[PDB]
Amino acid sequence: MTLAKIELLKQLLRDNEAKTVLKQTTVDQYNIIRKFKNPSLRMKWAMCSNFPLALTKGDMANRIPLEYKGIQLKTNAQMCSIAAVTWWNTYGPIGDTEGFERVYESFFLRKMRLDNATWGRITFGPVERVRKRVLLNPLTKEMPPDEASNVIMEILFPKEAGIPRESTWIHRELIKEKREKLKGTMITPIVLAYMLERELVARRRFLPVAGATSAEFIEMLHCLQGENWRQIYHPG
Amino acid sequence: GIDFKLGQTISRLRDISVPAGFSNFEGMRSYIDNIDPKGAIERNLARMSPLVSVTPKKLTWEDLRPIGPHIYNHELPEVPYNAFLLMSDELGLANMTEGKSKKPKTLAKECLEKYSTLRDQTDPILIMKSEKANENFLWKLWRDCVNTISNEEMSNELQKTNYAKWATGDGLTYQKIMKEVAIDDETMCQEEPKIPNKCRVAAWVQTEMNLLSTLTSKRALDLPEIGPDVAPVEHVGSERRKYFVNEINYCKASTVMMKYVLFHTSLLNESNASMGKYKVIPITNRVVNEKGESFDMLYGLAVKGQSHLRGDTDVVTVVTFEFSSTDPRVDSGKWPKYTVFRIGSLFVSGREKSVYLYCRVNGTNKIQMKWGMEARRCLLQSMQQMEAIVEQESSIQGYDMTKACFKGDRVNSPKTFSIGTQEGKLVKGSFGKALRVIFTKCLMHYVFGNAQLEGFSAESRRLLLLIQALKDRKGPWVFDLEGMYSGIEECISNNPWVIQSAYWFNEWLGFEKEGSKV
Amino acid sequence: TNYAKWATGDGLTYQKIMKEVAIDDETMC
Amino acid sequence: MNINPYFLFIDVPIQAAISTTFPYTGVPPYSTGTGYTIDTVIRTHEYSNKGKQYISDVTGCTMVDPTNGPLPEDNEPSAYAQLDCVLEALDRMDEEHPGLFQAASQNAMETLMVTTVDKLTQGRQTFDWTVCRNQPAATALNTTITSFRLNDLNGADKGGLIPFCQDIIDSLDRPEMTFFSVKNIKKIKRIPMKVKDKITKVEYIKRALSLNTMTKDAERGKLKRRAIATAGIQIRGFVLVVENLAKNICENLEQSGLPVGGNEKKAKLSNAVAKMLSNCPPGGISMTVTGDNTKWNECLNPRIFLAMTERITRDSPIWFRDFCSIAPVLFSNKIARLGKGFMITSKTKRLKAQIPCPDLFSIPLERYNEETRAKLKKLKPFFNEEGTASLSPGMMMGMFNMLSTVLGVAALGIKNIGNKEYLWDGLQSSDDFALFVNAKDEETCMEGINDFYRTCKLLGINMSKKKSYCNETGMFEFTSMFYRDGFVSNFAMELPSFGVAGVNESADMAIGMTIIKNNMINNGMGPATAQTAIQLFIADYRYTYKCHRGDSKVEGKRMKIIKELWENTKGRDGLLVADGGPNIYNLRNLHIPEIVLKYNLMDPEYKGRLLHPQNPFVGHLSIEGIKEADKKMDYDAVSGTHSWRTMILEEQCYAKCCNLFEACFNSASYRKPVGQHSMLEAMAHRLRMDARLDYESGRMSKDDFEKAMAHLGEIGYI
Amino acid sequence: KGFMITSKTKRLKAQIPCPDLFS
Ligand SMILES: [Mg+2]
């Protein structure tokens, strides 16, 4: 990769524009650089187009023929058609699923709570509810956003970890558990980082609550509560 | 620290952006920092003129007056039928099908093959020509549509594309010229605005409202299934949805809404796909009756013009030919925009009825094309109100109240609503009838919606709330009633729904006045 | 050249259409 | 029998049946906007004709100052707001809230000192002066920074937003202004290129003060179209800071309906009405006034906002006061770009031509229609040669929403005039206000309402006598929500959300389902209504994405593949709706992604196919939208094949540089990089460190080490 | 060459061939 990295850098510097932008834009400004009306209509029009999807250059295109059963999929002008995605879901490369069993632990735990929960009666009388600050979803271990970001960096970015702060030792068990569970997968680190942020960063909102306040009930608040109806729900 | 310092241009802009009485921003700064007002509001109010005031005035039933009296004037013309497609006069050529889904072209071809007498009708009989619409152009376009649909090929483009350029009026378009020529030219003046005509009440809107809130043997609205329900709340929701859809599925408003939605889907898809060609678009629907049989219903044809849509509001011309059985000569004032032809006749159960072809040139745009694809939001609007009412009733009594509200329980009586009136005697109707009336009202808000309807509804909300407060003996006060009345009345110009809503509002206000004596 | 097209009146030339449309049109005299 | 829908109101309260009255099921009205902008300018200057008229020496424009002018003598809207009256109101509010202005100012300063220039990339379309058009926030920001680089302005690369704003202020002083302009060179083809253009100081200042105009599109409660204004980038930071300060001030105020949304506002309405009723004296009456301010954007003078900011920051560092007083001054001297001109046609010749804004008066006014003729006759004094209107007085809606709400609450806080026998208080939020007056008789309640009307007129607040009414407490409206006897009939506007919402399959599904859940939580959507909404959304999603059930006989390009998939996979309940699989979403599981919901039900082969770690459709560069969806909304999804994604030379160059930076720095994607050095130096250091680690770790041979070191030395970092 | 017809308001012209002189 380092040889590939240096070759790509040399090929990029060969252009005057790339040289000037690289030497002029500071690291702080990089954010702005990475940022270059009616989404419904635009998406609608894109759907019926010959190739709406923007397929990144790579070696996987060869796995899917340009045309399949007389249906165009991709062109060399890359651009791709939804038919390619449908074929991929029909026949195509078989990935490794063990990663999801640990990477997407929040959603799996949500599904387990939904499945193993027990329901009861429903009361239709007026319900007294109070505006309270509640956590929408359960957290494995809540921490402030800066500490959560540091923890995620220490988890899935072993490098760039010079001078560890006074937060890795506090959450050493979480760090080691996440490092062990997340190994053996190949998903892009951005998805893993966002999932870990969701797991760790607490999301709180001012909501109307009448009864249980724990995040297990708050998750199903849309079904448990009601302006003139109440439900009994025991999370799994 | 931080030493954010001002330059010269910004300082001078600050200097000349100071309220009256100050020469420099430093003066304003010092005045605000040091000066301590001690009741400047009282002094200013004391020296303020007495003519400036809310002029409050108590509101009573007598102050409330009919809105838009001119709608009762008989001099003004009767409101015409400006809806995009025929709603209560629609005729649907029906062919039974096993259920297989096919392309609109093939469906229309089969429907026309079933009715060969109308398909092969080549000699027309004009009944009325609106004002300008050339009967020859419209008939040639209709024949072109029929031939293009009935041709063996699978292309949906008209076979002429060169006569249709003039029949649809696309050719008769002004040509742009550079600004300098216009400046030098003297005859080029800015076009005057088109003020909407002022019209009176019409009897076709009331008949349409009556007819489109009635049960029919044909159910068109079908919705995707949802996952199995296991909690009590979702069971209750499913039950309420079951009652609601049982009531609304078999009403003609639902079929009209589905026809509108499907036609707009096809129109938008064609516009996205075909850009520089004239297209043939059937007005198709799928209809299932009580027995479970499924039918394809062809309600006519449409010619979609040169869809060169640059932006969203850019106009695309659509020439619609629609089958109907109503003779327009019975009510001429309702059809001044439609060039109709008498194309044939058919027997439904042995009774012959004629079939006219209403031809009309209209225009659409991406906003309207898409918002015609979201007419199910009318269904949701209907659902919300009945859900609220049922929730209130079930809040009164602990057990769920849906069954009694609709069919009647062993302890409670069915709920009924004041639905209409006859000979000045108001009449009652079941909850299902009120549900259908609400659905028809929402559908009409959709089909007849424009700036005038939005303005009228928004400005009559004030009157409705004032009347509600008056009913509750809250003694509402209005500071300027005539201004509100004028704002409401400035929107009653051309929209049939707005005029009929004004008439209904006046009728209901009179009934409330009469009943307020108790 | 664009200005001279309209200044000389050459731009105000009547368009030619097919005989079918013209005969189907009652306003052509 | 003749059906009359209004008869429903005989059996149901209007508030309960108010949802059906809204025409939010039809087509919202859509629009040249030059005429609307001209009416806006004429009306804004018409309410202030009696003020002081002078000439702006900085710009050469005609300025009108209604503030501290003659008091109104009639019932027309007036902008003649007395400064001392506003100061009295502010002093009373500050007395009622000890140390609120100081705390808000200090908090705003604290959050400003840590803000970076990148924050300006948020928001909506902004006016780009380099091209004099409307460009996204990031594009305009980077264009302005690049142009500043040519004119010796180096604040943006300094990091914080203070140096960037300082360089924006300095840019107003430079004798000239060099930048890059788009040149559509003819070659036939129209090739757009970059031209090193230069403009003079006055023209650049006019560009900076210019506010581009557009015709409103999403408004649905009015029969006529109005004009919205988009500002440039020279004011976005200052306006952002001032709005942050205003929000800090108005968060504590109980009378303020901002910043709150959803169910909090319903609770605020109920609490306010209950508190007012409880305070009602024994035997008195509490009258509630449903109010609606007339326009109210064209009577608020920016000079009043300048005074308000000056008073709010009475005890702040002078630098922060000056910084906070830059948005109001740049607003009082604003210029309005008057649309795209008119259109004149010759009917006898069948010709048409657009007359652009600069040449509006180049045509004798006899050639305009009567309405436009009068418009231009009145607009001539305030018309600039370049084709812009000098609009000093008034404001354009949407710029200062929090500050105007603070002013309204200041007006409400008076609570009395002349110690009369009545007390007034109410709610105010962004042009929408409701009032309550407690007295002993209805006569005194109306006297208090009249006094409030006069006081508001003294402050520049003009409430409509046509759009407002009064009744007894216990029934009123606020921000379209209707309160009646404790049952807040939250109006139903949830319609324009059920339908595919944009980016892609999984994201659209998550967004829609979270929307259903949020509507259920906040607006009280019922179970049956939510299920119907799910059904409609499923129908719209299946149609739009051409993904119907496999068993259905529908024909299409993707439908044949879905049909094959239907029987090619044994388990038919595990496929996503995107692939024609059955829908499992119900009321109970609207918070869980559908990929995980069917995870157990997917055949191992199918899940392996869909959930491949490497997918050409999914690009690392396309993950930016996984977290938030444009308002910024958060949705929970699962990476998969359905997570796909839908100037040229600059785009390629930037994109590639950013991709290489991301590849070298894997953390840049997740967290914002920080650094005041060029990207090249950091990239080179990272590559050198990686090469050294690979060589020392046995992953990289000596020859490759020599090659990489030679390359780095050639780059010039050894 | 038949005859020629023209509409001034629409600024259109057409040529009617000899056979179509009576149509
Ligand atoms: Mg209001």
Interface test with chain D among B3, B172, B179, B284, by most D beta carbons within 10 Å: B179
CA dist., res. A208 & res. A230, Å (int):
13
The region that residue D471 occupies, defined by phi over 0 for left and psi between -120 and 50 for alpha, beta otherwise, is beta
Of D117, D110, D108, the closest CA to residue D159 belongs to D117
Distance set, CA D640 to CA A93, B352, D507, D547, D558 (Å):
13, 60, 11, 17, 18
Interface test with chain D among B376, B393, B395, by most D beta carbons within 10 Å: B376
Q: Is residue A14 part of a domain?
A: yes
Tokens for D75, please give them.
């019932």
Name the helix (H) or strand (E) containing B26: helix B25-34
Burial label, B352 (beta-carbon count in 10 A; 0-12, 13-18, 19+)? exposed
**Would you tell me how many other CB atoms lie within 10 Å of the CB of residue E6?**
14
Backbone angles phi, psi at D63, to 5 degrees: -105, 145
Q: What do you get for the CA distance between the two ends of chain C, in Å?
A: 34
Nearest C-alpha in D relative to B172: D350
Domain range for A78: 49-92
Q: Is residue A62 part of a domain?
A: yes
D346 vs E: CB within 8 A: no
Q: Do D19 and B389 touch (CB under 8 A)?
A: no
- Domain co-membership, A132 together with A207: yes
**Contacts (Cβ under 8 Å, ≥6 apart) of D582:** B225, B227, D549, D572, D573, D575
Q: A124 contacts in B (CB within 8 Å)?
A: 394-395, 397-400
Question: E13 CA to chain C: closest CA distance, Å?
Answer: 5
Of D661, D706, D702, D703, the closest CA to residue D680 belongs to D661
Identify the three-state secondary structure at position D437. strand
From the list B230, B232, B395, which residue is nearest A122 (CB)? Answer: B232
Burial label, B411 (beta-carbon count in 10 A; 0-12, 13-18, 19+)? exposed
Of D248, D234, D236, D239, the closest CA to residue D110 belongs to D248
| Alpha carbon of residue B391 to chain centroid | 29
Backbone angles phi, psi at B374, to 5 degrees: -125, 40
Subunits adjacent to chain A (3 or more Cβ pairs under 8 Å): B, D
Name the helix (H) or strand (E) containing A75: strand A74-75
CA dist., res. D684 & res. B160, Å (int):
66
Of D206, D147, D157, the closest CA to residue D177 belongs to D147
CA dist., res. D106 & res. D315, Å (int):
10
Identify the three-state secondary structure at position B448. coil
Of B134, B169, C8, the closest CA to residue E12 belongs to B169
Of D700, D654, B96, the closest CA to residue A29 belongs to D654
CA dist., res. D717 & res. D708, Å (int):
12
Per DSSP, the residues of D545-557 read TT---SSS----H
The residue extents of the domains of chain D are 28-79+333-390, 83-253+301-332, 264-294+400-409+418-484, 505-643, 648-715
Query: What's the residue count for chain C?
Result: 29
CA dist., res. C16 & res. B255, Å (int):
46
Of D487, D567, D576, D564, the closest CA to residue D538 belongs to D576
**Contacts (Cβ under 8 Å, ≥6 apart) of B457:** B445, B501, D21, D22, D23
Q: Is residue A65 part of a domain?
A: yes
- Domain co-membership, A132 together with A159: no
- Domain co-membership, A113 together with A210: yes
Distance set, CA D698 to CA B491, D704, E12 (Å):
82, 12, 84
CA dist., res. B451 & res. D293, Å (int):
21
Q: What do you get for the CA distance between the two ends of chain D, in Å?
A: 95
Name the helix (H) or strand (E) containing B176: strand B175-176
Tokens for D266, please give them.
């319903």
CA dist., res. D648 & res. D660, Å (int):
18
Distance set, CA D393 to CA A46, B10, D711 (Å):
45, 18, 62
CA dist., res. D129 & res. D335, Å (int):
13
User: Under a CB-based contact definition with an 8 Å cutoff, are residues E2 and E20 in contact?
Assistant: yes
Place of tokens 């000890």: D98
Identify the three-state secondary structure at position B119. helix
Interface of E with C (CB under 8 A): 5-7, 9-17, 20, 23
A179-195: burial string, b at 16+ Cβ within 10 Å, e else:
eeebeebebbbbbbbbb
Identify the three-state secondary structure at position B96. strand
**Contacts (Cβ under 8 Å, ≥6 apart) of C14:** E6, E11, E12, E13
CA dist., res. A79 & res. A69, Å (int):
19
H/E/C letters for each residue in A104-125?
CHHHHHHHHHHHHCEEEEEECC
Q: Do B504 and D5 touch (CB under 8 A)?
A: yes
CA dist., res. B283 & res. B277, Å (int):
19
The count of C-alpha atoms lying within 13 angstroms of the C-alpha of B118, restricted to the half-sphere facing its C-beta, is 32
Kindly give the distance from the C-alpha atom of residue B471 to the centroid of ligand 1, in angstroms, as a whole number.
Answer: 20
Q: Is residue A86 part of a domain?
A: yes
The count of C-alpha atoms lying within 13 angstroms of the C-alpha of D458, restricted to the half-sphere facing its C-beta, is 31
B303-338: burial string, b at 16+ Cβ within 10 Å, e else:
bbbbbebeebeeebbbbbbbbbebebeeeebbbeeb
- Domain co-membership, A109 together with A220: yes
**Any idea what DSSP says for residue A85?**
H
CA dihedral A32, A38, A41, A42 (to 10 degrees): -10
Sign of CA dihedral D92, D93, D97, D99: negative
**Contacts (Cβ under 8 Å, ≥6 apart) of D359:** B179, B183, D341, D387
Kindly report the CA angle at B84 between B81 and B90, in degrees rounded to 5?
75
Identify the three-state secondary structure at position B479. coil
User: Under a CB-based contact definition with an 8 Å cutoff, are residues B257 and B222 in contact?
Assistant: no
- Domain co-membership, A11 together with A120: no
Q: Are strands D351-355 and D388-390 parallel, antiparallel or unpaired?
A: unpaired
D153-167: burial string, b at 16+ Cβ within 10 Å, e else:
bebbbbbbbbbbbbb
Kindly give the distance from the C-alpha atom of residue D428 to the centroid of ligand 1, in angstroms, as a whole number.
Answer: 9
Question: D300 CA to chain A: closest CA distance, Å?
Answer: 30
Of D105, D396, D392, the closest CA to residue D245 belongs to D105
The count of C-alpha atoms lying within 13 angstroms of the C-alpha of D492, restricted to the half-sphere facing its C-beta, is 28
Burial label, D360 (beta-carbon count in 10 A; 0-12, 13-18, 19+)? buried
CA dist., res. B285 & res. B258, Å (int):
7
Of A24, D475, D80, the closest CA to residue B465 belongs to D475
Q: D666 contacts in A (CB within 8 Å)?
A: 157, 189
- Domain co-membership, A6 together with A123: no
Place of tokens 């004028």: B486
CA dist., res. D508 & res. B240, Å (int):
27
CA dist., res. E7 & res. B143, Å (int):
26
Q: Is residue A124 part of a domain?
A: yes
User: Under a CB-based contact definition with an 8 Å cutoff, are residues A79 and A55 in contact?
Assistant: yes
Query: What's the residue count for chain B?
Result: 518
**Would you tell me how many other CB atoms lie within 10 Å of the CB of residue D224?**
13
Burial label, D117 (beta-carbon count in 10 A; 0-12, 13-18, 19+)? buried
Q: Most distant CA pair in chain B: distance in Å?
A: 96
Of A41, A34, A78, A40, the closest CA to residue A60 belongs to A78
- Domain co-membership, A110 together with A8: no
CA dist., res. D612 & res. A97, Å (int):
8
Q: Do B395 and A125 touch (CB under 8 A)?
A: yes
Kindly give the distance from the C-alpha atom of residue D289 to the centroid of ligand 1, in angstroms, as a whole number.
Answer: 9
Q: C11 contacts in E (CB within 8 Å)?
A: none
The hierarchical CATH code for the domain D264-294+400-409+418-484 is 3.30.70.270
CA dist., res. A233 & res. A122, Å (int):
10
CA dist., res. A79 & res. A87, Å (int):
16
Is the preceding peptide bond at A208 cis, omega within 30 degrees of 0? Answer: no
Subunits adjacent to chain C (3 or more Cβ pairs under 8 Å): B, E
E12 vs D: CB within 8 A: no
User: Under a CB-based contact definition with an 8 Å cutoff, are residues D16 and B465 in contact?
Assistant: no
- Domain co-membership, A194 together with A207: no
- Domains contained in chain A, number: 4
Distance set, CA B238 to CA B45, B250, D517 (Å):
61, 19, 17
Q: Do A233 and B231 touch (CB under 8 A)?
A: yes
B188 vs C: CB within 8 A: no
Method: cryo-EM
Of D555, D619, D106, the closest CA to residue A78 belongs to D619
